[PDB]
Amino acid sequence: NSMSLNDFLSSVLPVSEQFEYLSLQSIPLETHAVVTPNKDDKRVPKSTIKTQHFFSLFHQGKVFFSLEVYVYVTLWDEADAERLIFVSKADTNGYCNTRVSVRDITKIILEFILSIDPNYYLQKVKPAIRSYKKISPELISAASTPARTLRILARRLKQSGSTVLKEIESPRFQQDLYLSFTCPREILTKICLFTRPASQYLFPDSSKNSKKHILNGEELMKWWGFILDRLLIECFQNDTQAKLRIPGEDPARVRSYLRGMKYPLWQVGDIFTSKENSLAVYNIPLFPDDPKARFIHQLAEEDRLLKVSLSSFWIELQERQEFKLSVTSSVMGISGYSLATPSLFPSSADVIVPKSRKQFRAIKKYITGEEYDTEEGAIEAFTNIRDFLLLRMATNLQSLTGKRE
Amino acid sequence: ENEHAKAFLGLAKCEEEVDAIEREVELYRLNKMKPVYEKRDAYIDEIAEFWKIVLSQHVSFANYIRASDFKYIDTIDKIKVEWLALESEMYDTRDFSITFHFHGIEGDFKEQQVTKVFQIKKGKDDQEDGILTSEPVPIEWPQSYDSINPDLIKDKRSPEGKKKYRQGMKTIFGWFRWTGLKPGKEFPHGDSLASLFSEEIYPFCVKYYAEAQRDLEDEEGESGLEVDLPLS
Amino acid sequence: SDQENENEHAKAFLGLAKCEEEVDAIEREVELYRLNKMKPVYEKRDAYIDEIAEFWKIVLSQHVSFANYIRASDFKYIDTIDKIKVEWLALESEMYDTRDFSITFHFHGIEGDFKEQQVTKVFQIKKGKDDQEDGILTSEPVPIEWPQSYDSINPDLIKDKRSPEGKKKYRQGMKTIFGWFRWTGLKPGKEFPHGDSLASLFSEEIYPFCVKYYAEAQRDL
């Protein structure tokens, strides 16, 4: 069994070759629902927890691969719980010296995420809005002004000769300042991928590297199509939803592309269609930097939310400017249960969790703020990520050797 | 038509009035803030690590330098910004001189005080805003950076050397040589970095320092510094 | 000397807290200073603006986000705006935020249906309960004569807000610009949407920089 992120990655990397990797994760946060709630609805989620997973792979002091993924867990007071994996971006810069399967790397990281028990994200959760009522003394919080903060520091010093509260992370306070939840380890899992071609996603100006291989929309869809198909076969139960939509394309072609997939249940469509056949706003998930959300926002800015329906929605969306055909854009969805039960809890070996969003963003930025017009950028990213971690976190990137023959 | 022209001109003259007013206002602010800055900085000296903490709390500052430089950024114990337009009208209100003092690292970095000056310059136009420029100032690079130090690099136009050069040029030490007069051959965006210090870092150091004192670490930056509203 | 040392820190923290407050005072003075100088220039500027026909109409059409805030049906009426005047309350008393201001519009009358009138709306900052809070713009509803076509949906006109139609039509009215005129900022989601952002749009962009917008419009033209 593969029980560590290292176990998963190595299995797919060339044997005897050294690779290092970054595995960054955000503190789970209480947040608004993935799909907008319908007041006239039987039920509503008690809570939604959002976490971002960021991965970068480095080979020989250079970074050549990255993957950005979000994981939502939705809790229903009575209606079970689902977890939704949103795949946001993946990219390469073409600066890898050795030969590897980016596809299997991407597939294997996703399996690892699948392996994680949902509860792991629910142990300690950052509240969307904290209440300090259960607590006096006065706390220095996000809301505090600098002057108030300065004054508080001074009083504390005078009282105790320290500016800190010892009991701040003490268990009673934790019970008060954080949320925790539990749920069946075996839950409904959904993955949503939207593919839109572009020259660069996570590696600015890498398009300018000749070594880099850029895919047109069709190639890209096929690429994500292939990965998903394996995920379905390898990690999912047999009667599981697999839906693919390519906007503006005739369904015989799409249906015909699907026929070719190894999993036999792929269908043309989306995993958001409902029995109740509600409005578009009530079935469409709002993801970060996502084609579906930008357009739901427009419908909001025009008081059309009530006006649109699901069938209408897809059609209306294809019309919009970001969608200039012919370019191929596809939306992919998976709904179902995992073969194996999700039991994994990640370790420091598995991931690095920064203390704040600020620190999380700072590290990521070293990778995504770089310029990859030339190799110097790939090296620089590796250099900063390493120096920054050691320096501010006393941490090292994970190191491993490829096992695959 | 003629009346319209008259108005249009008067309009163009009004926009020109506004600019003068803005400059006047800026000068007014600089004169008032001066004595508060002296008072404030004197208190800041009593605090240790104030600058180290501030430069770790500012978000975009990290964008301009190498992560390794933070070993040295952390030795800064004093920062002073004097705006030149207070000594003479010849200077733009954006002009300033900045002085940093570094305490040093044993066996690696020398304790020193460095002063850099930034001024606006123009090139042939009445209707051009102007750009920041500066003069190189000597700074003693840390020993750890011998390999990327422009003054110790032997094969400079060498292919490998040219890469060791460019690496040194993207450190905070490279920035001290920034001038703004040789585009593409100097520390990148040295003008923007200069602006951060005068516009944000020096002016708001205390807000930044207070940002680092939140009791719950996850709240740092939450201060500042995607769902709908369906029915009415 | 553990006491003495942690005591110099507490002194300096209080010093800084005082300086932070000195700086907030200065910012107000500076902003006033700016407002005082800008007044005469604005007056001179508006006096030139009348001479230009549809200056405001062109400007409103030209501004990027301004159109997002209101109904398309609304523009016909908007185009009838031939005068805008912003006055900064803080000039008249230390009791107003520098942000506080009053804004007047004059609407060219439209026949048969739309009356010509001058209206003044006032916005000021308010804070609630907690000292450590930013504050937000608020306003008082002010009378405005609605055009007849909007009569079906004029709120006063709607018979029952609750009926599904009323629920839908009334909502519609609030979303109009006229709806904005009754915006206060104290009944969240019961009023014109983002009424404060629009207000700030006016005192921070559309008014101070109307000229640039007009110009850009000419160039586009």
Side-chain angles (χ1 to χ4, degrees):
Chain A
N1 236 349
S2 292
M3 262 185 339
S4 88
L5 171 32
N6 278 41
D7 282 345
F8 285 92
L9 273 160
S10 25
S11 89
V12 170
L13 291 156
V15 72
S16 279
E17 315 223 32
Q18 271 287 132
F19 307 88
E20 299 191 73
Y21 77 78
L22 163 74
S23 168
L24 206 69
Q25 185 211 290
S26 77
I27 305 190
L29 170 73
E30 189 202 8
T31 198
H32 54 81
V34 177
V35 168
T36 299
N38 191 8
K39 328 263 180 151
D40 320 356
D41 167 314
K42 276 187 187 175
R43 48 156 209 187
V44 296
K46 62 151 138 201
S47 295
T48 306
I49 292 74
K50 175 211 212 177
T51 305
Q52 188 197 135
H53 279 285
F54 188 73
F55 311 87
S56 272
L57 252 70
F58 310 86
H59 170 68
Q60 276 178 354
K62 275 158 287 287
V63 68
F64 62 100
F65 172 82
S66 275
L67 178 68
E68 180 179 318
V69 179
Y70 289 83
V71 177
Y72 300 81
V73 171
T74 316
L75 300 194
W76 298 103
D77 252 298
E78 266 300 306
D80 287 10
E82 51 199 55
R83 81 172 163 182
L84 190 172
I85 298 185
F86 170 59
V87 174
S88 184
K89 281 151 198 188
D91 211 359
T92 66
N93 56 22
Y95 292 114
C96 190
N97 289 337
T98 185
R99 215 236 279 146
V100 289
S101 156
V102 179
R103 218 157 56 182
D104 294 332
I105 286 159
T106 308
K107 172 172 76 83
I108 213 72
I109 291 162
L110 290 164
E111 296 185 12
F112 162 80
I113 292 171
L114 280 166
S115 295
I116 298 178
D117 184 20
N119 295 274
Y120 163 75
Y121 302 102
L122 305 174
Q123 325 180 207
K124 203 175 163 187
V125 169
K126 183 172 157 56
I129 286 190
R130 267 197 196 109
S131 193
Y132 310 110
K133 59 188 154 199
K134 300 276 196 152
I135 302 149
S136 217
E138 191 176 8
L139 252 45
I140 295 167
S141 89
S144 295
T145 72
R148 167 63 44 93
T149 304
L150 284 164
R151 265 148 199 161
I152 292 180
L153 291 181
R155 286 161 11 197
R156 297 198 177 163
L157 280 179
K158 278 185 242 143
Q159 289 176 354
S160 64
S162 160
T163 55
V164 175
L165 296 189
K166 293 166 165 166
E167 66 278 38
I168 193 42
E169 291 288 345
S170 82
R172 56 182 175 175
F173 281 16
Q174 274 197 31
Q175 285 323 315
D176 266 342
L177 302 168
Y178 287 84
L179 315 169
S180 64
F181 307 106
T182 41
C183 80
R185 297 159 52 216
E186 183 94 54
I187 70 166
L188 189 52
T189 292
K190 311 191 169 193
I191 301 192
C192 308
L193 163 61
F194 198 119
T195 95
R196 167 171 307 252
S199 29
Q200 64 180 20
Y201 294 112
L202 298 156
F203 296 113
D205 291 341
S206 55
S207 44
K208 276 156 200 195
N209 166 18
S210 278
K211 252 168 102 190
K212 199 202 178 161
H213 179 207
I214 295 100
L215 318 201
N216 69 20
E218 197 209 323
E219 278 149 344
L220 183 63
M221 169 202 91
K222 290 199 170 177
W223 197 80
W224 276 109
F226 175 106
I227 292 154
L228 282 210
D229 197 26
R230 297 294 181 192
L231 277 188
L232 279 161
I233 282 156
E234 309 185 346
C235 327
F236 276 101
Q237 281 193 36
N238 186 16
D239 299 273
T240 293
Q241 289 196 62
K243 306 265 174 54
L244 170 73
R245 228 167 222 288
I246 308 181
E249 169 81 278
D250 71 310
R253 210 172 263 123
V254 190
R255 219 146 48 213
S256 181
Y257 170 60
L258 301 199
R259 231 159 181 256
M261 303 258 71
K262 296 309 167 196
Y263 181 74
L265 287 39
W266 276 95
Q267 276 198 27
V268 183
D270 58 270
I271 61 149
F272 311 118
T273 57
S274 69
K275 206 197 199 188
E276 53 236 18
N277 192 31
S278 330
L279 275 66
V281 296
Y282 295 157
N283 278 271
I284 296 303
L286 310 177
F287 298 133
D289 188 341
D290 188 63
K292 308 188 302 291
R294 291 179 204 126
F295 177 63
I296 287 280
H297 283 300
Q298 301 186 52
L299 295 174
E301 178 169 295
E302 308 172 1
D303 223 331
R304 244 153 100 51
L305 302 173
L306 292 97
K307 308 249 197 161
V308 181
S309 96
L310 272 168
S311 320
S312 324
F313 171 85
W314 294 111
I315 302 298
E316 204 157 338
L317 165 83
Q318 141 86 344
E319 293 177 350
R320 297 294 181 192
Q321 284 255 335
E322 58 195 318
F323 278 61
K324 266 202 167 170
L325 280 102
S326 177
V327 85
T328 313
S329 297
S330 81
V331 188
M332 301 188 200
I334 283 178
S335 199
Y337 294 90
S338 325
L339 275 179
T341 291
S343 54
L344 177 63
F345 264 67
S347 54
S348 295
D350 290 309
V351 304
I352 305 171
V353 187
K355 65 175 177 184
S356 63
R357 175 175 68 192
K358 191 182 153 318
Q359 189 177 80
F360 184 93
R361 275 174 184 156
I363 309 180
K364 191 179 166 184
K365 185 89 193 226
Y366 278 130
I367 303 301
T368 71
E370 253 318 339
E371 281 166 330
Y372 302 86
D373 49 2
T374 81
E375 183 179 61
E376 293 177 350
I379 286 157
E380 203 61 27
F382 170 72
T383 292
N384 291 334
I385 284 289
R386 181 198 59 191
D387 297 351
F388 184 90
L389 290 169
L390 267 154
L391 208 57
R392 291 276 185 253
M393 286 146 94
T395 319
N396 292 100
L397 293 178
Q398 259 291 359
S399 196
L400 59 63
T401 299
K403 294 165 165 277
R404 153 189 293 183
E405 295 85 357
Chain B
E1 176 187 320
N2 192 31
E3 188 60 58
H4 269 219
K6 151 92 127 32
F8 281 60
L9 300 181
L11 283 192
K13 162 148 193 180
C14 276
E15 299 308 316
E16 282 172 22
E17 290 214 56
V18 162
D19 302 18
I21 304 201
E22 290 301 350
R23 177 195 164 77
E24 274 177 82
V25 174
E26 177 63 16
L27 255 183
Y28 183 78
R29 194 176 56 78
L30 291 178
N31 264 293
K32 294 200 134 179
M33 289 297 308
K34 170 157 179 184
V36 189
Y37 283 144
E38 297 171 349
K39 213 190 318 274
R40 181 198 84 175
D41 291 358
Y43 288 126
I44 289 177
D45 305 29
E46 302 307 320
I47 292 151
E49 295 302 320
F50 178 90
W51 290 111
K52 153 179 166 26
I53 290 166
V54 174
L55 298 157
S56 290
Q57 278 301 313
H58 192 275
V59 178
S60 64
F61 165 76
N63 291 358
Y64 302 94
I65 52 154
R66 276 198 150 195
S68 50
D69 293 339
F70 272 112
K71 185 184 189 195
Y72 311 95
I73 293 310
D74 285 351
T75 54
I76 294 177
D77 33 29
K78 181 196 257 291
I79 289 191
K80 221 294 184 51
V81 165
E82 297 192 76
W83 284 263
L84 299 188
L86 297 181
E87 297 151 20
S88 155
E89 154 214 9
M90 307 280 81
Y91 294 121
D92 192 293
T93 52
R94 284 167 296 187
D95 305 341
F96 70 102
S97 93
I98 183 170
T99 290
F100 305 78
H101 173 245
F102 312 82
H103 71 55
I105 291 173
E106 171 86 24
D108 191 27
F109 190 44
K110 180 178 171 286
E111 200 207 63
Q112 64 206 274
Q113 179 209 304
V114 188
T115 289
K116 185 150 174 95
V117 183
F118 297 79
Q119 301 178 4
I120 293 275
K121 273 179 166 44
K122 298 177 192 179
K124 303 172 168 188
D125 297 23
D126 289 345
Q127 295 85 0
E128 260 188 340
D129 213 3
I131 68 188
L132 244 30
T133 68
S134 189
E135 304 270 339
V137 296
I139 178 143
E140 198 80 3
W141 292 48
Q143 265 182 273
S144 306
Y145 283 17
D146 285 342
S147 64
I148 60 187
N149 184 331
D151 288 347
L152 303 180
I153 283 166
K154 293 179 179 179
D155 297 323
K156 198 184 271 198
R157 286 205 190 178
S158 86
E160 166 163 330
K162 179 165 194 174
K163 292 173 197 52
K164 288 296 183 181
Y165 187 73
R166 300 191 54 94
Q167 290 187 3
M169 282 305 89
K170 61 183 31 179
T171 70
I172 188 61
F173 307 106
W175 175 71
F176 288 94
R177 314 181 157 229
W178 182 93
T179 73
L181 311 170
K182 299 163 163 296
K185 306 180 177 181
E186 287 164 321
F187 176 94
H189 311 290
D191 53 336
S192 301
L193 183 46
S195 284
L196 276 188
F197 280 114
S198 60
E199 296 173 9
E200 297 172 24
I201 300 178
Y202 182 79
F204 311 138
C205 45
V206 173
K207 310 186 186 180
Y208 287 111
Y209 181 89
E211 196 78 18
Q213 310 301 297
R214 278 82 177 101
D215 287 310
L216 292 143
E217 292 274 52
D218 63 35
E219 294 188 5
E220 52 166 25
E222 265 197 27
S223 151
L225 265 159
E226 196 71 82
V227 80
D228 301 12
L229 179 62
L231 314 154
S232 77
Chain C
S1 80
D2 280 333
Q3 179 89 350
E4 88 179 54
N5 192 31
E6 64 210 24
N7 267 346
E8 288 303 301
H9 281 245
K11 265 154 85 159
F13 290 150
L14 294 166
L16 285 178
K18 267 136 163 27
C19 300
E20 277 314 282
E21 275 158 352
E22 292 202 45
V23 171
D24 288 340
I26 286 182
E27 283 173 0
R28 189 183 157 81
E29 289 175 336
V30 167
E31 179 57 18
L32 272 197
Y33 185 91
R34 178 190 89 76
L35 290 182
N36 266 306
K37 286 183 172 275
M38 288 290 309
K39 195 172 164 177
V41 176
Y42 271 140
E43 281 178 4
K44 203 186 166 182
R45 151 189 126 155
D46 295 349
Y48 285 114
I49 293 194
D50 300 35
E51 267 51 37
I52 319 174
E54 341 207 310
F55 171 80
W56 288 117
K57 155 187 184 308
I58 294 169
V59 175
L60 292 163
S61 286
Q62 182 72 31
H63 191 270
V64 175
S65 48
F66 168 85
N68 296 347
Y69 294 112
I70 61 171
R71 265 193 152 249
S73 335
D74 279 349
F75 261 107
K76 300 142 188 179
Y77 306 68
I78 289 306
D79 289 336
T80 74
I81 310 173
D82 61 356
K83 179 169 149 74
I84 304 186
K85 175 66 134 29
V86 165
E87 288 180 69
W88 277 271
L89 299 205
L91 279 170
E92 273 140 325
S93 161
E94 63 185 342
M95 308 268 145
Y96 284 119
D97 193 87
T98 56
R99 278 171 296 164
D100 301 336
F101 72 94
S102 64
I103 179 184
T104 291
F105 294 86
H106 172 290
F107 283 95
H108 198 342
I110 272 233
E111 239 170 37
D113 121 47
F114 192 168
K115 145 117 58 137
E116 84 176 302
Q117 47 199 318
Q118 137 162 338
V119 197
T120 282
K121 176 110 182 168
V122 186
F123 302 79
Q124 23 185 326
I125 291 305
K126 299 184 106 72
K127 289 201 189 194
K129 254 194 271 286
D130 184 1
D131 279 45
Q132 269 40 19
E133 273 158 356
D134 301 302
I136 53 172
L137 281 189
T138 33
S139 187
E140 299 287 339
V142 51
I144 186 167
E145 194 96 35
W146 293 53
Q148 304 172 348
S149 326
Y150 281 17
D151 278 345
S152 103
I153 83 167
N154 175 309
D156 311 337
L157 297 215
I158 293 183
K159 285 95 161 172
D160 166 279
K161 320 196 253 189
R162 141 192 184 191
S163 72
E165 295 302 320
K167 172 151 164 113
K168 173 157 295 183
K169 301 297 126 153
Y170 166 88
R171 185 182 328 276
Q172 272 204 348
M174 289 308 272
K175 299 237 221 207
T176 59
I177 186 167
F178 307 97
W180 178 64
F181 279 97
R182 48 180 73 206
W183 177 91
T184 85
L186 307 159
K187 293 110 83 179
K190 275 196 164 199
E191 281 161 344
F192 181 95
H194 319 279
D196 51 326
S197 272
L198 177 63
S200 295
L201 213 56
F202 280 103
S203 58
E204 296 182 333
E205 290 172 37
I206 287 166
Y207 182 87
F209 314 129
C210 45
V211 195
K212 308 217 237 261
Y213 289 115
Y214 186 72
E216 293 201 2
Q218 294 300 320
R219 301 211 221 285
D220 255 20
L221 177 63

